Amino acid sequence: GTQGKVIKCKAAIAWKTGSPLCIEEIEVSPPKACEVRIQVIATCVCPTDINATDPKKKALFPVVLGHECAGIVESVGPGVTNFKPGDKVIPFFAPQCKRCKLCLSPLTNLCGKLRNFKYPTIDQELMEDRTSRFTCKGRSIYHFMGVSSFSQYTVVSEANLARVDDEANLERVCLIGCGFSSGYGAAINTAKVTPGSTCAVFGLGCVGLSAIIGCKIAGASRIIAIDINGEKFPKAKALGATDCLNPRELDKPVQDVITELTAGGVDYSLDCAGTAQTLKAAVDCTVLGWGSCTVVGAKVDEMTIPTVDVILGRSINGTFFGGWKSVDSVPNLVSDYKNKKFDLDLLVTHALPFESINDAIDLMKEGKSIRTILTF
Amino acid sequence: GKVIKCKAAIAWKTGSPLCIEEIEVSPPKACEVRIQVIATCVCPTDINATDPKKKALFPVVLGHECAGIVESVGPGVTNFKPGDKVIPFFAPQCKRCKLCLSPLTNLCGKLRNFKYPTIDQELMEDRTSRFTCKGRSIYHFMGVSSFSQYTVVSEANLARVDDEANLERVCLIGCGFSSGYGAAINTAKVTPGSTCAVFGLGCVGLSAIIGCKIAGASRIIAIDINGEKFPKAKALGATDCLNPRELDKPVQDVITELTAGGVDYSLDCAGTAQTLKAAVDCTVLGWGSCTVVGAKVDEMTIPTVDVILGRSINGTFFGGWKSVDSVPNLVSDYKNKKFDLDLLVTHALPFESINDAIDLMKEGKSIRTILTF
Ligand SMILES: NC(=O)C1=CN([C@@H]2O[C@H](COP(=O)(O)OP(=O)(O)OC[C@H]3O[C@@H](n4cnc5c(N)ncnc54)[C@H](O)[C@@H]3O)[C@@H](O)[C@H]2O)C=CC1
Ligand SMILES: NC(=O)C1=CN([C@@H]2O[C@H](COP(=O)(O)OP(=O)(O)OC[C@H]3O[C@@H](n4cnc5c(N)ncnc54)[C@H](O)[C@@H]3O)[C@@H](O)[C@H]2O)C=CC1
Ligand SMILES: O=CNC1CCCCC1
Ligand SMILES: O=CNC1CCCCC1
Numbered sequence: 182g183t184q185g186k187v188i189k190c191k192a193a194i195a196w197k198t199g200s201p202l203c204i205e206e207i208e209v210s211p212p213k214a215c216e217v218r219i220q221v222i223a224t225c226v227c228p229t230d231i232n233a234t235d236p237k238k239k240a241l242f243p244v245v246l247g248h249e250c251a252g253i254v255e256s257v258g259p260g261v262t263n264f265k266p267g268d269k270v271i272p273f274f275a276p277q278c279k280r281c282k283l284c285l286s287p288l289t290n291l292c293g294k295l296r297n298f299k300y301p302t303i304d305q306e307l308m309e310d311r312t313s314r315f316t317c318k319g320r321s322i323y324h325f326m327g328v329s330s331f332s333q334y335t336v337v338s339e340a341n342l343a344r345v346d347d348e349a350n351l352e353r354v355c356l357i358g359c360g361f362s363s364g365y366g367a368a369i370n371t372a373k374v375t376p377g378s379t380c381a382v383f384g385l386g387c388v389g390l391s392a393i394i395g396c397k398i399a400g401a402s403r404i405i406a407i408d409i410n411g412e413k414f415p416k417a418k419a420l421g422a423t424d425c426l427n428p429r430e431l432d433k434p435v436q437d438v439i440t441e442l443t444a445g446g447v448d449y450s451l452d453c454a455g456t457a458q459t460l461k462a463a464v465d466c467t468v469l470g471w472g473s474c475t476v477v478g479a480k481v482d483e484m485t486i487p488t489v490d491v492i493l494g495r496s497i498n499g500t501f502f503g504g505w506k507s508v509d510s511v512p513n514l515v516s517d518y519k520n521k522k523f524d525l526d527l528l529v530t531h532a533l534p535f536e537s538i539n540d541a542i543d544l545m546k547e548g549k550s551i552r553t554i555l556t557f
Numbered sequence: 558g559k560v561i562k563c564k565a566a567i568a569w570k571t572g573s574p575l576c577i578e579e580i581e582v583s584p585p586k587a588c589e590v591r592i593q594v595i596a597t598c599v600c601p602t603d604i605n606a607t608d609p610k611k612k613a614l615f616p617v618v619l620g621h622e623c624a625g626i627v628e629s630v631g632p633g634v635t636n637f638k639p640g641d642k643v644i645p646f647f648a649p650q651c652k653r654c655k656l657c658l659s660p661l662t663n664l665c666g667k668l669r670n671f672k673y674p675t676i677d678q679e680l681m682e683d684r685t686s687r688f689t690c691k692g693r694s695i696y697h698f699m700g701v702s703s704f705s706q707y708t709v710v711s712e713a714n715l716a717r718v719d720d721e722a723n724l725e726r727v728c729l730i731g732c733g734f735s736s737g738y739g740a741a742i743n744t745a746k747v748t749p750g751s752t753c754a755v756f757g758l759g760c761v762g763l764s765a766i767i768g769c770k771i772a773g774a775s776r777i778i779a780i781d782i783n784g785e786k787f788p789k790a791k792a793l794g795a796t797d798c799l800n801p802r803e804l805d806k807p808v809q810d811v812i813t814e815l816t817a818g819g820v821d822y823s824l825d826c827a828g829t830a831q832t833l834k835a836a837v838d839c840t841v842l843g844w845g846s847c848t849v850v851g852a853k854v855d856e857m858t859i860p861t862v863d864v865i866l867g868r869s870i871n872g873t874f875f876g877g878w879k880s881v882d883s884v885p886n887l888v889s890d891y892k893n894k895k896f897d898l899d900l901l902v903t904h905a906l907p908f909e910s911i912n913d914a915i916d917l918m919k920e921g922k923s924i925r926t927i928l929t930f
């Protein structure tokens with residue numbers, strides 16, 4: 182684990198699609214220029230990781246999945262000075278090189294670092310110099326979304342991580358790595374929820390729940406939580422939801438129930454589920470004139486919206502990592518948590534050994550968990 | 558309260574052109590004004606009403622883009638008097654509802670059908686018509702019905718304008734110009750130094766180009782499959798012109814390459830499945846904004862990834878202008894030469910030759926044909 186030397190450690194590898202992850206012993210090369218090798222302390226399983234193991238979806242194999250985590254810097258490549266061994270950090274799929282047009286713009290959190298703009302899931306599958314830091318059984322392993330946290334040690338670009346509070350609880354702040362930040366920021370930054378406004382959140386998993394926390398912090402007077410899984414309602418309400426609706430138990434489309442309940446629709450809707458149903462419902466349930474729909478989750482490649490709807494005032498946009506300038510914002514979210522601005526503990530339903538990663542996956546696929554904290 | 562006998566164009570049924578008929582225009586009741594139409598244009602929306610594939614009501618007095626003068630006002634009306642120059646419009650501002658009070662929209666509670674606005678405001682406020690022809694009551698069209706020497710509109714559908722206004726040009730403010738102009742300024746919210754793309758170069762797209770220029774855009778790309786529309790687009794500010802028919806690559810890729818990433822704002826003033834798709838594709842990632850103005854199809858398919866990567870989509874209704882309050886100002890701006898509406902008028906024809914104005918429009922030979930009496 183010493184600097185400059187290759188590290189051998191446990192990691193979950195997906196040798197191919199539609200298969201369960203395999204606990205292997207891999208070789209993690211040392212960081213090259215502008216890279217940082219991190220000791221992953223805690224990591225969660227995000228549906229996007231599972232999505233990668235879906236035969237119906239495009240992906241690269243073999244690969245070290247995982248991208249939501251927190252850890253400690255083990256070593257930094259040549260020329261790196263903003264990071265040093267011992268620092269607590271949180272990597273993320275959304276880079277912020279701070280040295281490009283996109284990074285300079287206050288209108289986006291995208292970065293010129295990103296290359297693929299049609300399949301973000303298969304981008305950042307290798308380091309800058311198009312090579313991998315991972316090796317297992319003489320084979321080269323693909324990185325995932327610039328993070329690959331399903332390994333006790335991973336190497337990431339400097340543009341893909343932030344140093345956080347020295348006293349940050351790595352087993353909770355790891356949620357800031359993707360899930361929490363994405364939903365929280367979708368409400369605050371992308372949808373731009375305003376005080377006294379009404380909101381609708383579709384999908385009550387970690388993202389949807391964080392979106393609710395965000396709407397609450399933003400001052401929404403009413404937050405309608407929608408999910409086909411009634412179990413998700415208690416946690417939703419505990420986080421600020423004022424109304425809960427299960428499309429499965431309604432005789433009318435859920436968007437028409439929301440419209441009636443609010444006498445015209447909500448000011449802001451956030452789809453944190455992403456199905457054909459939710460995407461359409463998320464747009465329909467907003468008020469005409471100024472209704473705003475924000476796409477957060479997306480299980481489908483397209484959404485179809487009537488021309489008359491946009492003409493009559495409905496707007497549609499979407500988020501990428503909650504609209505946060507990652508490097509600058511992540512440290513702030515960690516501080517907000519330290520100051521108890523929101524409670525990340527309510528997002529953790531399970532905590533298993535890394536070896537039990539496949540069980541963490543099943544729990545999620547089965548919708549029996551929000552987030553499962555995996556530790557090595 | 559005299560009943561006026563005049564000529565007007567009536568659409569008796571779908572699939573048939575308008576007919577010049579002698580009609581009886583009843584006097585204005587409460588909160589109403591009887592206008593003497595001085596100049597009116599045919600808008601593609603007027604033409605669509607007679608298209609079998611489109612929802613519409615019959616019989617009907619079509620038209621909604623015009624300018625005229627007050628012939629007589631209804632009981633209690635004080636904001637209008639005979640002789641005042643006025644401009645009616647489909648976007649009402651009754652100033653008696655919740656929507657009118659809201660600074661986040663220019664919609665109005667007077668509107669009732671939000672799925673088919675073209676068949677809305679088909680009758681006055683008291684659900685009765687002011688038009689009669691051969692013992693038959695005729696529907697009004699979008700609260701205006703300008704294809705008549707005289708028409709009656711709700712007070713919420715008109716505004717008094719500058720006494721020295723050239724009704725022969727300011728009539729464009731009744732719909733086409735206001736919508737395109739406002740789409741750029743109010744809806745897309747074009748910013749100084751920005752790059753824009755305008756699809757469809759008819760009266761709306763051209764006005765959108767004018768809007769983009771006034772808003773300070775530094776680059777305005779004009780796209781149309783009809784190259785004959787470019788000269789005027791350039792005359793109004795277009796910096797680049799692209800004809801999809803003459804490009805081997807999809808026009809959106811050409812726009813993206815020509816701008817190294819796309820434009821900041823796109824405005825679709827054509828409305829086909831292709832332009833709507835191109836309008837979104839050609840915007841930059843991160844903050845690209847597509848504003849739907851024209852719409853020939855009921856739906857638009859947006860890739861989920863586009864929105865996630867920063868592109869946004871919205872639409873305009875009468876250019877987002879609070880009609881009653883804004884219309885008078887647009888007239889003043891023209892008076893002050895803030896922009897020149899004369900360029901939008903390509904032809905002039907006697908009202909009775911309305912069907913010829915319609916044919917010109919369908920041949921793509923015109924922007925706006927003024928119909929006079
Ligand atoms: N845009 C961005 O930057 C990000 C997007 N995401 C995406 O957001 C989504 C949500 O993430 P998680 O909360 O972690 O996932 P999750 O699987 O825990 O959440 C899905 C929830 O939506 C519900 N649902 C499914 N179909 C539904 C329907 N028809 N109507 C209502 N509810 C329905 C489920 O019952 C479940 O509670 C995922 O699709 C994920 O890939 C995650 C991070 C960032
Ligand atoms: N949202 C709102 O409140 C309003 C919407 N409109 C609508 O806006 C649209 C435009 O109105 P006008 O300028 O008066 O109509 P128009 O018929 O004169 O304009 C259409 C123009 O687009 C071009 N075009 C057609 N297919 C094209 C393609 N694939 N690519 C590029 N250009 C293409 C045509 O050659 C033509 O020059 C109409 O659909 C109209 O109903 C008009 C007023 C207000
Ligand atoms: O879950 C993490 N990341 C993904 C979510 C879908 C859009 C791109 C980023
Ligand atoms: O062209 C004039 N008006 C259009 C405005 C958008 C709705 C259909 C009517």
Ligand SMILES: [Zn+2]
Binds near residue numbers: 227229248359360
């Ligand atoms: Zn994720």
Ligand SMILES: [Zn+2]
Binds near residue numbers: 280282291294
């Ligand atoms: Zn950057």
Ligand SMILES: [Zn+2]
Binds near residue numbers: 600602603621733
């Ligand atoms: Zn019109």
Ligand SMILES: [Zn+2]
Binds near residue numbers: 650652656666667
């Ligand atoms: Zn009103």
